[PDB]
């Protein structure tokens, strides 16, 4: 089955990297990447959330409508890093 590095805790979690089994309805994986402070320099606990998906898709680089870095793949553990 499709396995993605989905963490149990929300963005609050530090290293969101845990081997989890996706659902049968799904097919691809998803990943949310959005720093806490992009407008100004501030190194702090970032906001991310990796979850399975039934359709790997991405938005525009505009990110005008809450369209952060939405990565996706069709391979188990396609990405180990955050």
Tab-separated table of C-alpha atoms in Angstrom:
chain	number	residue	atom	x	y	z
A	1	UNK	CA	0.000	0.000	0.000
A	2	UNK	CA	0.968	3.663	-0.352
A	3	UNK	CA	3.157	4.768	2.555
A	4	UNK	CA	3.990	8.407	3.293
A	5	UNK	CA	6.045	10.099	6.009
A	6	UNK	CA	3.012	11.461	7.857
A	7	UNK	CA	3.461	12.616	11.452
A	8	UNK	CA	0.912	11.982	14.205
A	9	UNK	CA	1.022	15.545	15.530
A	10	UNK	CA	0.119	18.706	13.570
A	11	UNK	CA	2.496	21.406	12.337
A	12	UNK	CA	3.353	21.914	16.008
A	13	UNK	CA	5.559	18.836	15.657
A	14	UNK	CA	9.253	19.457	14.996
A	15	UNK	CA	10.392	16.715	12.619
A	16	UNK	CA	7.219	15.595	10.845
A	17	UNK	CA	8.641	12.311	9.557
A	18	UNK	CA	6.880	9.043	10.386
A	19	UNK	CA	6.134	5.963	8.283
A	20	UNK	CA	2.349	5.802	7.958
A	21	UNK	CA	0.064	3.655	5.806
A	22	UNK	CA	-2.197	5.610	3.453
A	23	UNK	CA	-5.802	4.729	2.618
A	24	UNK	CA	-6.981	2.415	-0.194
A	25	UNK	CA	-8.919	5.241	-1.846
A	26	UNK	CA	-5.806	7.419	-2.034
A	27	UNK	CA	-3.007	6.952	-4.567
A	28	UNK	CA	-0.459	9.737	-4.100
A	29	UNK	CA	1.072	11.630	-1.178
A	30	UNK	CA	0.936	15.290	-0.151
A	31	UNK	CA	3.227	17.672	1.732
A	32	UNK	CA	2.671	21.150	3.167
A	33	UNK	CA	5.645	23.494	3.528
A	34	UNK	CA	5.161	27.014	4.887
A	35	UNK	CA	7.706	28.801	7.075
A	36	UNK	CA	6.512	30.811	10.075
A	37	UNK	CA	8.125	34.032	8.858
A	38	UNK	CA	8.919	34.468	5.164
A	39	UNK	CA	8.505	38.244	4.978
A	40	UNK	CA	11.181	38.779	7.628
A	41	UNK	CA	14.181	36.824	8.977
A	42	UNK	CA	13.022	34.599	11.835
A	43	UNK	CA	14.228	31.059	12.537
A	44	UNK	CA	11.463	29.280	14.449
A	45	UNK	CA	9.321	26.137	14.431
A	46	UNK	CA	7.982	26.058	10.847
A	47	UNK	CA	4.487	24.946	9.839
A	48	UNK	CA	4.195	21.747	7.804
A	49	UNK	CA	1.871	18.760	7.431
A	50	UNK	CA	2.382	15.658	5.292
A	51	UNK	CA	-0.759	13.692	4.423
A	52	UNK	CA	-1.877	11.194	1.783
A	53	UNK	CA	-3.923	12.251	-1.244
A	54	UNK	CA	-5.987	10.761	-4.070
A	55	UNK	CA	-4.615	13.135	-6.706
A	56	UNK	CA	-1.130	14.657	-6.784
A	57	UNK	CA	-1.534	18.311	-7.764
A	58	UNK	CA	0.151	21.677	-7.223
A	59	UNK	CA	-0.854	25.344	-7.260
A	60	UNK	CA	0.809	28.460	-8.669
A	61	UNK	CA	3.952	30.156	-7.291
A	62	UNK	CA	1.768	33.174	-6.528
A	63	UNK	CA	0.530	31.676	-3.258
A	64	UNK	CA	-1.958	34.551	-3.181
A	65	UNK	CA	-4.718	32.255	-1.964
A	66	UNK	CA	-3.065	30.289	0.831
A	67	UNK	CA	-1.246	28.288	-1.843
A	68	UNK	CA	1.912	27.319	0.044
A	69	UNK	CA	4.427	24.698	-1.090
A	70	UNK	CA	2.179	21.714	-1.795
A	71	UNK	CA	4.397	18.815	-2.865
A	72	UNK	CA	3.085	15.419	-3.967
A	73	UNK	CA	4.313	12.065	-5.280
A	74	UNK	CA	3.181	8.577	-6.289
A	75	UNK	CA	5.902	6.616	-4.495
A	76	UNK	CA	6.074	5.245	-0.952
A	77	UNK	CA	8.325	7.505	1.121
A	78	UNK	CA	9.140	9.484	-2.024
A	79	UNK	CA	10.626	12.021	0.390
A	80	UNK	CA	12.251	11.298	3.753
A	81	UNK	CA	13.277	14.876	4.537
A	82	UNK	CA	10.806	17.463	5.831
